[PDB]
Design a binder for this molecule. Structure first.
Ligand SMILES: OC[C@H]1O[C@H](O)[C@H](O)[C@@H](O)[C@@H]1O
Ligand SMILES: OC[C@H]1O[C@H](O)[C@H](O)[C@@H](O)[C@@H]1O
Ligand SMILES: [Ca+2]
Ligand SMILES: [Ca+2]
Ligand SMILES: [Ca+2]
Ligand SMILES: [Ca+2]
Lengths: 134, 134
């Protein structure tokens, strides 16, 4: 609580040893990330099935901290770790209609939930994550 | 914090002294309340401006635990406390079109944010709150 209370007072909330922040504006993937960096954090990194479920239940399209390595169709989290367990929604990732879809969102759609690759210059609400305890 | 882990494994999350649960289905105000009771909780009770802001930032229409006393246009939280500080959206509460709007939702609309009285038999996602720390 000494650690957490200053963050709660700014609208962060706590799930399994991280704090999370949901933005009140949409932004490009890069400027979303810049906000989280400025807060001493980063875009959210999904490390378990439970954290994915927690993410999905906000019923909100959210940028998360996963981005393609160049155009290689391989993926790295913002902390540098490679993608291992994934929650792509059906049919994704797909560089839809031949567009460069290098940044990852969590989608909120009827009959389609999970991650989607999207153009990084499109805008979404975004979720920051700060690990508090190891 | 160890006692939060079973709740976190079910998708609850921690803000200030409470755990919160956002439903994955819509329901009537009364059946929403029944779900929260059977988890040892109740519908959410808004006790401060910070908690209202926390609620508003989910950008979700949610039943919360405020309900009219009969048809008297006075209000009581599900824990029995009378309404004191309030966050009605502009023009609310209003018994819209002469309907009995006895139950309270947090609305997520353009140029209209805050609470709204609504027919209790209508359906919304709902938020449970459980006080964990004294
Ligand atoms: O608008 C961009 C998106 O459009 C559609 O939802 C496609 O399913 C998805 O793959 C694409 O990235
Ligand atoms: O449809 C129910 C609601 O409709 C409109 O939003 C009115 O502004 C609100 O007062 C009423 O409760
Ligand atoms: Ca994480
Ligand atoms: Ca895509
Ligand atoms: Ca409360
Ligand atoms: Ca109303």
């Amino acid at each position: 609580f000494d650690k957490l209370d200053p963050y709660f007072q700014q609208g962060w909330f706590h799930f399994q040893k991280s704090l999370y922040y949901i933005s009140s504006v949409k932004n490009t993937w890069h400027l979303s990330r810049e906000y989280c960096l400025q807060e001493g954090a980063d875009l959210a990194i999904i490390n378990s099935r439970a954290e994915q479920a927690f993410l999905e239940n906000f019923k909100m399209t959210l940028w998360i901290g996963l981005m393609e390595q160049r155009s290689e169709r391989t993926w790295r989290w913002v902390d540098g770790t490679p993608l291992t367990e994934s929650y792509w929604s059906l049919g994704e990732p797909n560089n839809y209609e031949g567009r460069q879809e290098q940044c990852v969102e969590q989608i909120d759609r009827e009959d389609k939930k999970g991650w989607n690759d999207l153009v990084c210059e499109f805008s979404n609400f975004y979720m920051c994550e700060k690990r508090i305890f190891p």
